[PDB]
């Protein structure tokens, strides 16, 4: 497992540090006291350097002992290709991140139509991960798919798509009846509580925020990733004021790209 890899590389650097620090002790003692103007000042400098070197040796030995407490347990062509594959994969990950952070594309111009089967395959692929979210697709009105995403015992989100691109979302509480009299989805309602109206507003900013132009799978996957973080409503405190309640509201803002809780008044 990877923790053994990290502990072994850690303890490798611990041995190298121990050896170099012992040699540094004996090298600084080889040179002897320097001059340093004031006699009192030169004595102080020599004593301080020797003490620091000894302390560093002790720290390195202690760290090696701590890793010891925590440690657990033609053919060359294949390994060369394996190493070069991992190298290319990591290199490409870094270069792709650096380049798509800073794109120079200004306009798409130079000089939506999808089978519903594809939408069902995509959304079932999202439903297979996140075992606490269940997504139930239905199409009461044409090709525009409507999704009920239940989330723990916490949320019921009604997502109204339009050609495999999220359009509207409505977040209601668990007990709340999301069905009309006839058992269809109540696409147009609100949720009787202050908290879930705030989370509808935050979800509309979430669907306005996660916008790739072309590829919509990253959009729906990232929206569900962000939505999954709301399972710690009523349990997470705000990361600005520490408390749970500002004006009788839990922290309704799970921040994009770092899913942390905030009261929206604490931005």
């Amino acid at each position: 497992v990877s923790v053994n890899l990290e502990a072994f590389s850690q303890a490798i650097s611990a041995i190298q540090a121990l050896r170099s620090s012992v040699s540094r002790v004996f090298d600084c003692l080889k040179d002897g006291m320097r001059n340093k103007e004031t006699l009192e000042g030169r004595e102080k400098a020599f004593i301080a350097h020797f003490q620091d070197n000894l302390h560093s040796v002790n720290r390195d030995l202690n760290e090696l002992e701590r890793l010891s407490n925590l440690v657990g347990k033609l053919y060359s062509q294949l390994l060369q290709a394996y190493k070069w594959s991992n190298k290319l994969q990591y290199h490409a990950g870094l270069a792709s991140g650096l380049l798509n952070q800073q794109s120079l594309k200004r306009s798409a111009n130079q000089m939506l139509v999808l089978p519903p089967q594809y939408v069902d395959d995509v959304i079932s692929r999202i439903d297979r991960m996140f075992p606490e979210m269940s997504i139930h697709l239905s199409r009461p009105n044409g090709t525009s798919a409507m999704l009920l995403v239940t989330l723990g015992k916490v949320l019921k989100v009604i997502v109204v798509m339009r050609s495999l691109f999220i359009d509207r979302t409505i977040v209601k509480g668990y007990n709340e009846n999301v069905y009309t009299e006839d058992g269809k989805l109540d696409i147009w309602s609100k949720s009787n509580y202050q908290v879930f109206q705030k989370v509808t507003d935050h979800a509309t900013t979430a669907l306005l925020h996660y916008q790739l132009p072309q590829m919509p799978d990253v959009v729906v996957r990232s929206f569900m990733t962000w939505l999954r973080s709301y399972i710690k409503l009523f349990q997470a405190p705000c990361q600005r004021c520490g408390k749970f309640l500002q004006d009788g509201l839990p922290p309704t803002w799970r921040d994009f790209r770092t899913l942390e809780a905030f009261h929206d008044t604490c931005r």
Binding site: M33, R34, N35
Partner: protein, 256 residues
């Protein structure tokens, strides 16, 4: 000069001359056989100055070892390999070092030996006698035989040849000058640190202040380190001059 004979046996020869006669007639390769015939109750000191002589005896042993290891190869020792008189002097000092080591073992030079069943002083004395018998011949100029060459090739294996400081650290102008070209100097601009006379290793940046000789360039620290244990027979020779003759001249501290 230091050995004061406690009683005069075989008079009309001072113990320097008795030692030189005995070391020049006894050509034995062992150090014990030379040391036996030398009246060794005469070679006695008070075991205080005898201990304080440690650094000069260290230079003697280190120079002998450097010279013998330098034999297989123009270097800082090339003249001494063929001078019979200086090798005789080095023999005599090794014999009196052996006697003084038997009186007190702390006066001896130290050699980092790559073996523990070794008598390093006797090894160097064996090689020194075998080199010196080459040159103590009358009208000789005997080139050294191959047995000595391979034995002195084995010396870096058996002991570690340390390093040595060679005195004329040349900053004199006369080597630097040329006819028809004058040096244009500024005042005060001036276009492994040892004390060369008492063989003490100063640090990287030395804390105690120093004199420098104005001709050779040797450095000594200004006041003696231990005023109680000081071999004043050696320190009081160089009060007014260096050994080369030039004057002392106080050097300023670095303060880096």
């Amino acid at each position: 000069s230091l050995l004061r004979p406690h009683f005069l046996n075989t008079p009309d020869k001072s113990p320097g001359d008795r030692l030189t006669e005995i070391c020049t007639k006894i050509t034995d390769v062992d150090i014990d056989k030379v040391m036996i015939n030398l009246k060794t109750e005469e070679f006695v000191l008070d075991m205080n100055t005898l201990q304080a002589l440690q650094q000069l005896l260290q230079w003697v042993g280190d120079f002998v070892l450097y010279l013998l290891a330098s034999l297989p190869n123009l270097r800082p020792g090339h003249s001494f390999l063929r001078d019979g008189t200086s090798l005789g002097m080095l023999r005599e000092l090794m014999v009196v070092i052996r006697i003084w080591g038997l009186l007190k073992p702390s006066c001896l030079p130290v050699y980092t030996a790559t073996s523990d069943t070794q008598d390093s002083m006797s090894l160097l004395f064996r090689l020194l006698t075998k080199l010196w018998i080459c040159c103590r011949d009358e009208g000789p100029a005997s080139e050294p035989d191959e047995a000595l060459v391979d034995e002195c090739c084995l010396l870096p294996s058996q002991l570690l040849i340390p390093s040595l400081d060679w005195l004329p650290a040349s900053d004199g102008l006369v080597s630097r000058l040329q006819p028809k070209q004058p040096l244009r100097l500024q005042f005060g601009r001036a276009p492994p640190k040892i004390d060369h006379l008492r063989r003490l290793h100063l640090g990287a940046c030395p804390t105690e202040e120093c004199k420098a000789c104005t001709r050779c360039g040797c450095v000594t620290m200004l006041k003696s380190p231990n005023r109680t244990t000081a071999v004043k027979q050696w320190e009081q020779r160089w009060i007014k001059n260096c050994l080369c003759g030039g004057l002392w001249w106080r050097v300023p501290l670095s303060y880096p």
